[PDB]
Design a protein around this ligand. Sequence first.
Ligand SMILES: OC[C@@]1(O)OC[C@H](O)[C@@H](O)[C@@H]1O
Ligand SMILES: OC[C@@]1(O)OC[C@H](O)[C@@H](O)[C@@H]1O
Ligand SMILES: OC[C@@]1(O)OC[C@H](O)[C@@H](O)[C@@H]1O
Ligand SMILES: OC[C@@]1(O)OC[C@H](O)[C@@H](O)[C@@H]1O
Lengths: 378, 373, 373, 373
Amino acid sequence: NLNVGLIGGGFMGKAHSLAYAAMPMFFWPAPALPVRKVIAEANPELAAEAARRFGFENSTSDWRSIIDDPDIHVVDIATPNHLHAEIAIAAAEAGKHIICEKPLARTGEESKAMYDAVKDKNIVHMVAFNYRRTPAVALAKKYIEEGAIGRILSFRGTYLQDWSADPNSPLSWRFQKSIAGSGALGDIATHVIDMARYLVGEFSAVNAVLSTWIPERPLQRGGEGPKGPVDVDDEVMTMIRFANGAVGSVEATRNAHGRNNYITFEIHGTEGSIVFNYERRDELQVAFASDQADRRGFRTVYTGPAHPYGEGLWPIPALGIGYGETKIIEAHDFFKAIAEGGSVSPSFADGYQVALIDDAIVESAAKESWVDVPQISA
Amino acid sequence: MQNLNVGLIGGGFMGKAHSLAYAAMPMFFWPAPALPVRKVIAEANPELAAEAARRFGFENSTSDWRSIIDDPDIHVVDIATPNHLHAEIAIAAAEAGKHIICEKPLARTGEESKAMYDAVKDKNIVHMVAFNYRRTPAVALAKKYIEEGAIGRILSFRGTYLQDWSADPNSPLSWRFQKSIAGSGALGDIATHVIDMARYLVGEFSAVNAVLSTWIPERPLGPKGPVDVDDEVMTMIRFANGAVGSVEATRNAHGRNNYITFEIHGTEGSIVFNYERRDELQVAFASDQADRRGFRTVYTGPAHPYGEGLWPIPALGIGYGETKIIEAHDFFKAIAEGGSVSPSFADGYQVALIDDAIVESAAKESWVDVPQI
Amino acid sequence: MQNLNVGLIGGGFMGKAHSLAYAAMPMFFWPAPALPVRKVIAEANPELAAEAARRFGFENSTSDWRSIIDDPDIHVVDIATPNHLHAEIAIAAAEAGKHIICEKPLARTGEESKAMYDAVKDKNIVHMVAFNYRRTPAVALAKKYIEEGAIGRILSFRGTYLQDWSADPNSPLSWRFQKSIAGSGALGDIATHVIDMARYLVGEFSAVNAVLSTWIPERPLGPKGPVDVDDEVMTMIRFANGAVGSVEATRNAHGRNNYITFEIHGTEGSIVFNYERRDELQVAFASDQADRRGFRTVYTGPAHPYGEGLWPIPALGIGYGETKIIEAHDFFKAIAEGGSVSPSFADGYQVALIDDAIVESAAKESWVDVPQI
Amino acid sequence: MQNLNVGLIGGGFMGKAHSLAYAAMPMFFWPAPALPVRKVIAEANPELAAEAARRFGFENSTSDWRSIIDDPDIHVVDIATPNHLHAEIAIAAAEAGKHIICEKPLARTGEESKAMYDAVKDKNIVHMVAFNYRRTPAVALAKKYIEEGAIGRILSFRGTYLQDWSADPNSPLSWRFQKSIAGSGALGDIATHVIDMARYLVGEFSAVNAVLSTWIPERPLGPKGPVDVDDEVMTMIRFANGAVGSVEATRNAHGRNNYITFEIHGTEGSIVFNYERRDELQVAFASDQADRRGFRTVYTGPAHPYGEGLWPIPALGIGYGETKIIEAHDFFKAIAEGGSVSPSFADGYQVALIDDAIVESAAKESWVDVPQI
Ligand SMILES: OC[C@@]1(O)OC[C@H](O)[C@@H](O)[C@@H]1O
Ligand SMILES: OC[C@@]1(O)OC[C@H](O)[C@@H](O)[C@@H]1O
Ligand SMILES: OC[C@@]1(O)OC[C@H](O)[C@@H](O)[C@@H]1O
Ligand SMILES: OC[C@@]1(O)OC[C@H](O)[C@@H](O)[C@@H]1O
C-alpha cells in the first residue's frame, strides 16, 4: 500500500485518480497498491468535493500538510505550472516519491531547482509525458531499437489543437506567462519533444519561430466583457539537429481548426518509416524497405497482446486504448520503480532536459538563429 | 449519494472491464447517480475468487454465486459468466428482487432467454443486457443525428463485426466454440452487438435470411475436439419500418481485430462508424453546399452525447473502458430514479429471437419472420 | 504495327472515355500491339455526329451506324449506346466479321445477351464487354496475390458499388430509370461491375438470394414519369468453389460517389479495395510477424501488374482513363495475336444470367441457382 | 477554332505526359480554346526522335531542336528536356516569337532563370512553367475556398513532397543527382512544386531558413560518382502577408511515393490535401455546429473548379494526366485569347530565387530574405 497525496484536482484530476483506482486491475500482480489517501485543493469546500468525486479518503486546502504527513509515500503534483517547483522541492526534502505534471516548471532555471532537489535523494521522480506510453509509441521504440527501420535520418512531430482557436475562449492561466511560463511550447510541444528524445535521441540545436495569433482574450457574453493580454505563444515551429546527426522539426499550435489532440510523428530511417497519429492511437503505421517490391507500403498495426505493455491491457487489438490507459501504464511503471527501488523514464532529469530545449527554442526565436541545446550535465 | 452494493459473478475478461466501470464511473459522471460498491465477487473456486477480489478491489469473495443472491445487502447482480449460466443466475436474482446487468448474449437460445425475460417482465427492477458498443459516444451521436431528422428517413443499414483472434486453426477449443456452453458462435458472441446497434439506430427486425458458415471444424483442446458452432454469419434484414439491411460477423477475417462497423443511408444523409477508430463518427449531409459536400469526420468530446462525463477535448481518447463506464452510469441512473434502462432483458430476448430466426433461416434457406413480444 | 480502324457508336459520356483510350493507348503501352485509328463515329443525328467527330477526333461521322457495319475498312466496332441498341448492333457487327467491344451491361436481359454471345461464339473475332474496373492496377494486383496463394483459399467476399448522383428525387428521368431501355437499374448499370470483379477474383457464382428496392418511384421529366427499375440491390452469393459472399449496389447513398469496393477473406490473408482511392490496395498477410501484422497500403506502379505501361512512380496517379487505356491495350493485343480477351461476351452473358437470377430471386424471395452459359 | 502546331522537345517521361495532354485536351474541354497539333518532336538522336514520333503521334521528328525554333509554322514550343537545356531553348524560342511551356524547375540557377524571364517578359507571347499539381482539381478547390474567405485569414502553411524512388543507395547516378545538369536535387526537382503551391494558395515568400541534407553521397553510374546535390530539404518560411510555414521534400522516405501534401490553418477553418489521394480535399469549417465539426472529405467532380472539363461524377478518378490536360487547356486558352497564364516564367523565376535563398540560408545557417523578380 502506497499512500498518494494528489495536489490539484482540476481538468487533469479525473485522469490521475483513474490511474490510481484502476492500475492494479490491469497490471496484476501489482508491485504496490496505490491508495488515494489525501487530495489538496485551493479551498476546503473544493478539496472535500474533489475528495468525494475522485475517491480520496481525506481532503485538505493546504498542500504543505501532505508534505508534513509522514504516512504519505507519493506526492502527485497536478497544479498549474507556477507551483510545480515549490511543491516538488518540499516533497523531495521530505523524502517523498514525486510524479509531476508537465511542463516540469515555467523555465529551465526553475526546472533546474527541481532536478537539483531530487538528483541526490533515494526517491523515484517522474514527469507526466504520458503519451510516450501509448502502446503504439512504445512499439515504435521497439522497432527502432531492433534496427527494423535502420538508422534514423529524419523526424517530424506535431501537436495540433484548436480548443482556444476562438478568440472568445477566456484568458485562463495557460495564457499567462507568469503562471504557465509559455503557451503552446510548454503545454503541448513538450509532449512531442519528449517523444523525439525517446524515439530519436538528444537535441543538439534548434531554430524556431514563436507566433501569437490572438493577443487579447476575455478575463474569466461573446467576449464583450473586460479583456487581458496573451503574453505567451499560440504556436511554435522549430527545426532540430539531433546529436546523432538526424534532422527534424516540431510544430505545435492552439489554432488549427479540425485538429483536436493531433500529436503525430513521422520518422524516416534508412530501411523503413514509422507514422503515428494519437487521434487514432490504437494504430502504428510502419513501412519496411525489406518487403517484396510488389507488396511494399505502410502497414497499419493495431496494438494488443503482442505489443509492448500488451500483457496489462485488453485481450484483443482495437478493443480500444483511451487517454486513461496511458495514465495507467504510467502509474504501473512509477509504482514498479518504487517497489523495486529503481527509477523510471521520463524522470525530473528528462523534465529538465525538455525545459532546457524550450529555453533554447525561445532564445532561438528571439535571436532568429540556431541555438545549441545544453545537456543537463553542463 | 446512496451506496449500491454490487455482486459480480465472473472475474475473467468482462470481470475486469466491469470492475473498472464500478471503480471509475463516479469520477467520470459527477455528481454520480449512485456510488457503486464492489461488495462481493464470485468465481469458480475459492483461490481464484480471493485473488480476483484483491485484483478488482472487491470487499468480499465467494466461490458460490448463490451466496450473492441470498445476501440481502446486495442491490445489483452483475452476470459476467459464460453463456450457460446466464439464465439460472438472472432468474434467481430476479426472484430475490435484485437489479441485474447480464452479459451478452442474454442466454444460449430464445427459449432460455424467454425464461429470463418472464422472470423480470412483471417486476420493476432495472434489468440490462450489456450491449456496451451502442454507448460508444460516436454511436450515441449517430442516434442523435437520426432522431433529429438530420439524415432524413433511413433506407438502408449495413453492419459488421469482423474479428480474427481464432483465424488460426491452432487456436484452441474454448467454451466459445462449444454449442452446449455458448449456444452459437460468431452469431451469439458478436453479431448480437451489431443486431443491437441496428435495433437502436434503425428499429425492429421484421424478417431475416441468413447463411451460417464454419471454416475450422476442429481445434486442439495433442488431441482435438469438434467445433459445432458458426465461425461466421451473414444475414439480410427487412426492418419493420420498411428499411432494408444486412449484418455480417466473422471470426475468420485476417487483419480485422475488433471491426464493429455500420453504414446507414438516409434520404438526406449517411452515417459511417468504425469501432477500430471509435473516437470518430463519419456523417455526410445532403444539405451541404454542392461544392463542399461529403463525409465529415467528427471526433467525440464535450459537445457530443455523454461528453460532460468524459474527457475535456475530442480525441483525448475513448477506449473500451469508457463504454462500460457509460453503461454503468446509465444502469445506476435507472436504479437511483426507479426508471428503466435500454437495452433491457426485453431487448436481450428480442435479440435472442432474432438469432433463433437467423439459425432457422439458414437451416431452411428461406426468409423467417422474427417473432415479436 | 497494323492500323486498326475503329467505328465508335455513341458519343455521350462513354464516347469521351473510349476516344481517350484510342488516342492514348500506344503512348502508354509501347510498342503497341496495333495503332487504333479513330475512323468513324456514329451518333443519333448528323449535327450531333459531326460535332462528336470534331470533339473526339474522328476522321468521319455518320448518323447511321449501319453504314459503319457495311464499311469493309472498319476492323473494330465499339458500342457505347444505351442498353437497348447493344444487341442489334453487336449481332450485325458479328455477321460482318468485325471485332467488337461493347459497353456494360451486355444487353437488357439474359435472353437478349444470349443472342449476342451466340452471334460471336463461333467466329474468329475478338469480343469484349467493357468491365474496365477489373483492370484497375490494384484489382489486377489483388488477382496476382490470390493466384500465387498469398492469401490462401478464399472464404468470403464482400463487394459494393455505392453512388449518389440520383439520390435527389428532383434529378430527372433518363433512360437509366426506364426498364424498356436499361433492362434494370443499379443492378445492370453498376452491380454488374462488382459481379464481374467477384467472378474475376473469386470465381463462378452458384446461387444468389436478393432484395431489390426502389426508393424514388417517380422523377420529373412539372410532369413526372415512373421509375420501373431498382435503385438498389443486395444479394447473398454462394460461389461454386464453396466461398460465400454478398454484393450491394445503390444510387441512393449520400456521400458515396463511385464507391466500388471489395473485401476478401482468405485462410492466410485479406484484401480490401476502394476505387475512390484506386491507387491503393490494402492487403493483410497472416504470415507477418505477430507484433507487425495488419493491412499494408500498397500503391500501384512499375512493380505491379500493367506497371510497365503506366506511370514511372507509384501514386503519380491512376484515373478512370488509365483503366480504359489498359482495356484497349488488351483488346488490341488479342486482335493482333489472334487470341481472346477476358471479359468477353461469354463473360457478359454470364453476368446477364446472374442478373436474371438476382431479379427472379428477389421476385420469389428465394435462392436461385445461377445457370452456367 | 485555331489549330496550333506544337514542337515538343524531349520524349522521355514528361514527353509522354505532355503528348497525352495534347491528344486529350479537346476531348475534355469542348469546345476547345484551340486544337493542338502534335507537329514535330525533337529527341537526342534521329532514331529516338522517330520512335518517339510514332509512339506519341507526332507527324514529324528531328534530332535538332533548333530546326523546331527556326520553323515558321511552329506556334508552340514545349520544353521537356533535363534542366540544363531549358534556358538555351526557351531564349531561342522567345526570340523566334513562339509561345513556350517549359518544365520545372525553370532553369538550374537564379541567373539562368532570370535570362529566360528577361527574354519573354516584353514579348507578346504566352509563357508557362509546368507546375501542374496546382491544377489538381482539389488544389483549385482549395484556392476557391481561400479566395472566398471560407477559412478566414491564413495563419500557417505546411507543405511536403516525400518520395522514395532513390532511397536505395544502389539506384544509379542519373542527371537528377548531378549538380551541373539539375542545378539542385530534391529542392529543384520536387520542392519547387510545393513552393509553387504555397505561392498560389498563401502568397509570396518574404524569408526562408533552411537545412539541406545529402544522405547517399555516392552512387553507381564499380566506380561511384559523387552526388553533389541535396537529397532532402526542409525550410521555415515567413510569408509577405504575415503567415508562417514550412516545406519539406526528400527522396529518402520509405513508404512515401508521390506524397505532395499541404495543411493550411486559417482563422475560420483548415484545409488538408494529399496528392496520393488527389481526388479528395479535406476541409474543416469553424462555422459548423459544435456537435458536427471536423474535416469533410470532398471528392472533386462537376461542382468543383475545372469540373466541366473532367469526369461526370466525383471519384470516377483523376490521375496525373488530367493535371497535364488542365495545364494544356489554360495554356491554349491564354494563346487563343491573347492573355497570359499562371504560373508564367515570372513565377518560374520567382521560384528559382526562392531556391537560391534556401541554398544561401542553409550554407549561412541564417534567415535569408527572398529577392523579388
Ligand atoms: O491544454 C492542452 C492539454 O490539456 O491538452 C491535452 C494534454 O494531454 C495536456 O497535457 C494539455 O495540457
Ligand atoms: O469473443 C470476442 C469478444 O470478447 O470480443 C469483444 C467483445 O466486446 C465481446 O463481447 C466478445 O465476446
Ligand atoms: O450510371 C452510373 C455510371 O455512369 O457510373 C460510372 C460507371 O463507370 C458506369 O459504367 C455507370 O454507367
Ligand atoms: O524526379 C521526380 C519526379 O519525376 O516526380 C514526379 C514529378 O511530377 C516530377 O516533376 C519529378 O521530376
